[model samples]
Target: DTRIGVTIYKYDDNFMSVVRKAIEQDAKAAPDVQLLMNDSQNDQSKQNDQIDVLLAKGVKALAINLVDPAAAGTVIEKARGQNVPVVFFNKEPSRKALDSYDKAYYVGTDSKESGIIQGDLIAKHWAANQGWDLNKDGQIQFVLLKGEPGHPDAEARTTYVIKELNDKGIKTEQLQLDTAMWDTAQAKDKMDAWLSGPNANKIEVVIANNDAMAMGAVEALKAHNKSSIPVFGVDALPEALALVKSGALAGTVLNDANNQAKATFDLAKNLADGKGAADGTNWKIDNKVVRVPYVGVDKDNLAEF
Candidate 1:
């Protein structure tokens, strides 16, 4: 039997860890199916190389989480030449690439939805506490902890979250938007340094693209004794959820990592069973672009996650 393959950008990411375990569980449930995956360590070059290596290894179906979403065309074209079915999970390529071939499909949540959820929460939370301006002298001074540069999730979450604030008639000021590359420790160091400067007191909120960075910001805030500053992030990682439950974080948008993995696995499983993109898993959105919805998580709705 031809094995299934999934190449992840980084296995160490907190949310991806859950996604990985879920994929593993899904793989285990079907004894006849075999699955393989690789870690990109957040490097596009390495991911591209790994994809090449995996494709040459006789895997019938390939699931990929592109290290850089921009370079998706290269991988898609490569897979198309081999006539192999490709599944893109978590990270998304350009629409042109997905539309280029019927053999390729994406299984992930709606990137913009996560940001909208975050934005809506921010608007309501800002009002619930009256405002995010701690010193309340002027516009909101916020620090953005971004994921990898050019990542769609990072871009959408960054844009829509702030846009929601604007759409809700809130004022904002960008103090800094640092690309943390989705590393929690890096985000911790970045926040730790940000708080060491004169801008520390001016920062009203720490908005991270993911919970790993949010937890990192929380650590930095706790370290600096500025825990009162509202912090928001996406992907309700277990640590982030715990912190949210304890009020360390303002809130987060749940990315539904498990469902995403499950969806990806189901799609790949069907492909493993000789089903192509046209016949995908029988549960998919346009061309098997299965979109798992994002949800808001806070103390009020904490248990549901």
Candidate 2:
């Protein structure tokens, strides 16, 4: 049996945690493979060290969720030195590093697509329910709860989502964009601060980069007795789904962590068996990248997910 090494950026991240679990479940079903997993704890240096250990242990391939995308090249160098294939997920690496090696592959979603889908959901819902315009000023006043600083997904989601809304002829005013770093409590605190300030009653909607923050924003709103405000987010987490059903969340974008995990594991397993990354899989690879897609999840379509 072959040993496959998997490393997560952080076990605490809601989405990545699900990805890891799905990978583990897949590994359990494959009796011919032994999986070695590590928690990077959000430290790139620690992740590098863990990779070194895995490489030393003679693992056939690596499935990594990089703690810092800047370390992609360094990680690739190490993997290439050992002639091991590397599959990167969640966080994306630079094109130069990805192209630097043929055995390197990425399995993830198109952040822009998620953003556009989320924006479309918001726009349509607002159109159907005119009351979303709390002030009736023909503009949506929203507070944005952003993910980690400089994260590709965070930036793309924030940028494209707003663009999508504007492109649909829905004017918007950003009350504020607070960097919650994808932490539920941090988002709650940020929202609490907003509710305590003058923007309290003015914020018509809450937009979050991921579900954790979206839930936090909803919690803050609930505490302030303003649960009527519509909240939107990416990553259709179970809790977020429940919130949508309860009308606390207007919608969420499904990041599809299960398919992403399956793709990553399957690709790594293929590579470990001395085959091409996508050799036995139906995943379409473009420039050494496999992009899983995002779907819109709202009250109307909640049953489907």
Best by TM-score: 2
Q: Any idea what lDDT model 2 has?
A: 0.92
Q: RMSD in angstroms, all models? A: 5.0, 3.8
The list of candidate 1 runs beyond 4 A from truth reads 9-17, 39-58, 67-83, 109-114, 127-159, 173-229, 275-284
Report the C-alpha lDDT of model 1 over 113-189, residue by residue, as the tens digit: 88888988877777788556677754567999999989878899889888988887887988888988888899999
Q: TM-score of model 1 relative to the true fold?
A: 0.68
TM-scores for every predicted model: 0.68, 0.78
Worst 10 residues of 2 by lDDT: 274-283
Residue 135 deviation, candidate 1, in Å? 9.6
